[PDB]
Design a protein around this motif. Sequence first.
Motif, mmCIF file in Angstrom:
data_model
loop_
_atom_site.group_PDB
_atom_site.id
_atom_site.type_symbol
_atom_site.label_atom_id
_atom_site.label_comp_id
_atom_site.label_asym_id
_atom_site.label_seq_id
_atom_site.Cartn_x
_atom_site.Cartn_y
_atom_site.Cartn_z
ATOM 1 N N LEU A 34 0.844 -1.227 0.000
ATOM 2 C CA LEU A 34 0.000 0.000 0.000
ATOM 3 C C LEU A 34 0.874 1.270 0.000
ATOM 4 C CD1 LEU A 34 -2.974 -1.200 2.316
ATOM 5 C CD2 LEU A 34 -2.985 -0.937 -0.204
ATOM 6 N N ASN A 38 0.847 4.052 -2.938
ATOM 7 C CA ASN A 38 0.786 5.498 -2.647
ATOM 8 C C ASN A 38 1.985 6.291 -3.166
ATOM 9 O OD1 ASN A 38 -1.782 5.332 -1.450
ATOM 10 N ND2 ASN A 38 -0.940 5.088 0.608
ATOM 11 N N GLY A 41 1.327 6.406 -6.757
ATOM 12 C CA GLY A 41 0.335 7.452 -6.823
ATOM 13 C C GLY A 41 0.874 8.870 -6.828
ATOM 14 N N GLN A 44 2.557 9.413 -10.145
ATOM 15 C CA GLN A 44 1.536 9.552 -11.152
ATOM 16 C C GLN A 44 0.814 10.894 -11.085
ATOM 17 O OE1 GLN A 44 -0.893 6.061 -11.566
ATOM 18 N NE2 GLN A 44 0.847 4.715 -11.809
ATOM 19 N N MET A 78 -5.606 7.064 -12.661
ATOM 20 C CA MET A 78 -4.671 5.995 -12.269
ATOM 21 C C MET A 78 -5.154 4.603 -12.636
ATOM 22 S SD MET A 78 -3.132 7.201 -8.674
ATOM 23 C CE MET A 78 -2.456 8.856 -8.701
ATOM 24 N N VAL A 79 -6.404 4.317 -12.307
ATOM 25 C CA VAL A 79 -6.949 2.977 -12.574
ATOM 26 C C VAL A 79 -7.151 2.710 -14.097
ATOM 27 C CG1 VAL A 79 -9.450 3.322 -12.378
ATOM 28 C CG2 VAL A 79 -8.407 1.210 -11.523
ATOM 29 N N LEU A 82 -3.662 2.033 -15.367
ATOM 30 C CA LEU A 82 -3.331 0.655 -14.956
ATOM 31 C C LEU A 82 -3.944 -0.369 -15.916
ATOM 32 C CD1 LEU A 82 -2.514 -1.643 -12.861
ATOM 33 C CD2 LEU A 82 -4.725 -1.025 -11.695
ATOM 34 N N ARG A 85 -1.802 -0.208 -19.371
ATOM 35 C CA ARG A 85 -0.532 -0.959 -19.140
ATOM 36 C C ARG A 85 -0.707 -2.465 -18.967
ATOM 37 N NH1 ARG A 85 -0.033 3.430 -16.041
ATOM 38 N NH2 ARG A 85 -0.193 2.246 -14.076
ATOM 39 N N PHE A 97 0.895 -2.254 -12.357
ATOM 40 C CA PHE A 97 0.938 -0.927 -11.746
ATOM 41 C C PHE A 97 2.163 -0.180 -12.286
ATOM 42 C CE2 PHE A 97 -2.536 -1.317 -8.793
ATOM 43 C CZ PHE A 97 -2.595 -2.640 -8.383
ATOM 44 N N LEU A 116 -10.287 -6.035 -3.815
ATOM 45 C CA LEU A 116 -9.980 -4.772 -4.430
ATOM 46 C C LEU A 116 -9.144 -4.986 -5.679
ATOM 47 C CD1 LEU A 116 -10.631 -1.911 -3.108
ATOM 48 C CD2 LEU A 116 -8.124 -1.692 -2.989
ATOM 49 N N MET A 120 -10.126 -3.787 -9.510
ATOM 50 C CA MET A 120 -9.248 -3.084 -10.423
ATOM 51 C C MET A 120 -9.017 -3.905 -11.726
ATOM 52 S SD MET A 120 -6.520 -1.127 -7.903
ATOM 53 C CE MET A 120 -6.089 -2.408 -6.755
ATOM 54 N N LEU A 206 -12.740 2.028 -4.683
ATOM 55 C CA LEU A 206 -11.347 2.429 -4.473
ATOM 56 C C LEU A 206 -11.263 3.640 -3.568
ATOM 57 C CD1 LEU A 206 -9.820 1.896 -8.098
ATOM 58 C CD2 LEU A 206 -10.423 0.217 -6.252
ATOM 59 N N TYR A 209 -11.997 2.641 0.167
ATOM 60 C CA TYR A 209 -10.865 1.873 0.709
ATOM 61 C C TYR A 209 -9.674 2.816 0.995
ATOM 62 C CZ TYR A 209 -7.280 -1.790 1.285
ATOM 63 O OH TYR A 209 -6.296 -2.581 1.809
ATOM 64 N N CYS A 210 -9.408 3.709 0.048
ATOM 65 C CA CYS A 210 -8.324 4.678 0.159
ATOM 66 C C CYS A 210 -8.578 5.620 1.340
ATOM 67 C CB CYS A 210 -8.174 5.471 -1.163
ATOM 68 S SG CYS A 210 -6.898 6.778 -1.053
ATOM 69 N N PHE A 224 1.381 8.098 3.227
ATOM 70 C CA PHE A 224 0.731 8.851 2.164
ATOM 71 C C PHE A 224 1.582 10.086 1.913
ATOM 72 C CE2 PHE A 224 -3.482 6.953 1.400
ATOM 73 C CZ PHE A 224 -3.554 6.048 2.483
HETATM 74 C C1 LIG Z 1 -1.472 3.558 -7.943
HETATM 75 N N1 LIG Z 1 -2.813 3.130 -8.399
HETATM 76 C C2 LIG Z 1 -3.067 2.717 -9.687
HETATM 77 C C3 LIG Z 1 -2.056 2.688 -10.673
HETATM 78 N N2 LIG Z 1 -1.188 2.671 -11.426
HETATM 79 C C4 LIG Z 1 -4.393 2.372 -9.794
HETATM 80 C C5 LIG Z 1 -5.016 2.594 -8.538
HETATM 81 C C6 LIG Z 1 -4.015 3.098 -7.683
HETATM 82 C C7 LIG Z 1 -4.049 3.372 -6.247
HETATM 83 C C8 LIG Z 1 -3.174 4.266 -5.623
HETATM 84 C C9 LIG Z 1 -3.194 4.415 -4.236
HETATM 85 C C10 LIG Z 1 -4.084 3.643 -3.480
HETATM 86 C C11 LIG Z 1 -4.960 2.709 -4.062
HETATM 87 C C12 LIG Z 1 -4.901 2.577 -5.472
HETATM 88 C C13 LIG Z 1 -5.854 1.864 -3.185
HETATM 89 C C14 LIG Z 1 -5.216 0.455 -3.059
HETATM 90 C C15 LIG Z 1 -7.334 1.807 -3.575
HETATM 91 O O1 LIG Z 1 -5.796 2.234 -1.767
HETATM 92 C C16 LIG Z 1 -4.903 3.109 -1.289
HETATM 93 S S1 LIG Z 1 -4.899 3.240 0.333
HETATM 94 N N3 LIG Z 1 -4.071 3.825 -2.108
#
Ligand SMILES: Cn1c(C#N)ccc1-c1ccc2c(c1)C(C)(C)OC(=S)N2
Lengths: 251, 251
Positions: A34, A38, A41, A44, A78-79, A82, A85, A97, A116, A120, A206, A209-210, A224
């Motif tokens: 995680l 982040n 993230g 990105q 981001m998703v 993902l 890719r 990722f 989760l 994705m 997402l 959860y985040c 974070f």
């Molecule tokens: C980095 N990333 C991609 C890509 N590439 C797709 C989705 C995400 C992305 C980024 C950060 C987080 C999350 C997904 C999830 C796992 C939901 O929960 C938390 S806590 N942080």
Amino acid sequence: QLIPPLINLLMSIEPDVIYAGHDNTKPDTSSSLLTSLNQLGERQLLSVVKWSKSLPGFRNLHIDDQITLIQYSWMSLMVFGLGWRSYKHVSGQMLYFAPDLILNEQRMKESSFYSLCLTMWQIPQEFVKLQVSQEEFLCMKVLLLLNTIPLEGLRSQTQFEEMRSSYIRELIKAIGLRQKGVVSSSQRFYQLTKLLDNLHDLVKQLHLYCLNTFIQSRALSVEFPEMMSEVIAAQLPKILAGMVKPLLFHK
Amino acid sequence: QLIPPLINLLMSIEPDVIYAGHDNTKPDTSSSLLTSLNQLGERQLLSVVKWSKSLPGFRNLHIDDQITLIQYSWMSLMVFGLGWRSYKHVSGQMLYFAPDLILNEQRMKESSFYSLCLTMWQIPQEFVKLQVSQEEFLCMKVLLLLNTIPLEGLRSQTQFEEMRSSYIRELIKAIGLRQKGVVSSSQRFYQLTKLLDNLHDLVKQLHLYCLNTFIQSRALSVEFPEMMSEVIAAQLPKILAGMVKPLLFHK
Ligand SMILES: Cn1c(C#N)ccc1-c1ccc2c(c1)C(C)(C)OC(=S)N2
Ligand SMILES: Cn1c(C#N)ccc1-c1ccc2c(c1)C(C)(C)OC(=S)N2
């Protein structure tokens, strides 16, 4: 040659490869996975900010509008990336990722957040089924950046409307590159825009959860970084509460 | 003899006066005021749990369901109790949080906080308009405790439903103490149960404001005590995300 200039421009401003900086010589833990997600993230996010500065039309919206759209749309961008890719590098059959953060299904199962991961993983699976092209992907990714606005609208609402309409017209041209025939190309526009509508709901899982993980980040040892923390704090509760306007292509 | 024994019981188990422990001495800031409301909220949380242990029927629900209902309804009980005190002590014309924390317009400087207070103010305004009685209020407040359940329902769902019908019957008795005619009685029941329905939307604004502030607490210099903190972290994101079932008397 046959590719519309805005689409070639979109391809030209795509980011290079972004690494997560994950160890990989150590066994995964919920906290290390995680934390890397982040960190990925944060990187990105930086990349989205840079991209957005080159994205035709975007710089001409009020700066507050630009910041808001990025804060609303970051998880969906981001998703979606993902999804792309994973589709292009691993035939959709792992979560790509980053080149240093690839989860096959077994690594998903042992993660602590299998369900989760599965959520994705739907996205690359849809890319396979629809055989989404690079040109359609590029246009759809812009529309995601423009896919939610405040309840009260934007400061530069007129300019946003013109820009969003222009990228919809561009997605139409991207479809026309392959889908020859009014009925096929009409159906294709439905399917692609339906996919985007369907992302709102997937991204809501997402988001929740985040947010929970951010609230509990000290207990869970999940870091974070700064810009990630800022976007989450600024908007996620308001987004989850439905106190924004998601835009839909279909009812 | 005229007052139904359950309503008498409800009067007797009502909490004693709760002070915020607020420092009226020093001039108030937005952060110091939010801190005082959170301290008052900590103290009120303890009184809700104590109250619920004497509330007929409640101790008979599965312990998980007890915890869930208190955690779901904490904000709504606090704002409903606030409406009662403001109505009783200040004719609904100030917000009587506590004997040492009474706010009027002049003490609501920040427009965000002022808008939030205007939202909370609707409750004592309606209490004044409808001339809500103590007996109605006490029955309504139990129905509030019981007014949201998990999506999958409760463990003691049958007992919960019997308990809810019991207090709906008791509210009818409460209304009959004063509303003499069948038509008057039915319209009064409509009005009181519509007020309860309308609290879901009202409380949603309080939940969102509270979560944002909790997320930014360190940066806003706002203290959140331990019990309040757990309630907010455990349920608010899920509630705001719509991942619970609010109960409605009307469609
Ligand atoms: C980095 N990333 C991609 C890509 N590439 C797709 C989705 C995400 C992305 C980024 C950060 C987080 C999350 C997904 C999830 C796992 C939901 O929960 C938390 S806590 N942080
Ligand atoms: C204490 N209290 C009563 C009473 N009495 C009614 C509502 C509240 C109450 C308690 C705590 C908080 C809040 C309201 C608000 C202002 C929403 O925001 C934050 S951050 N905390």
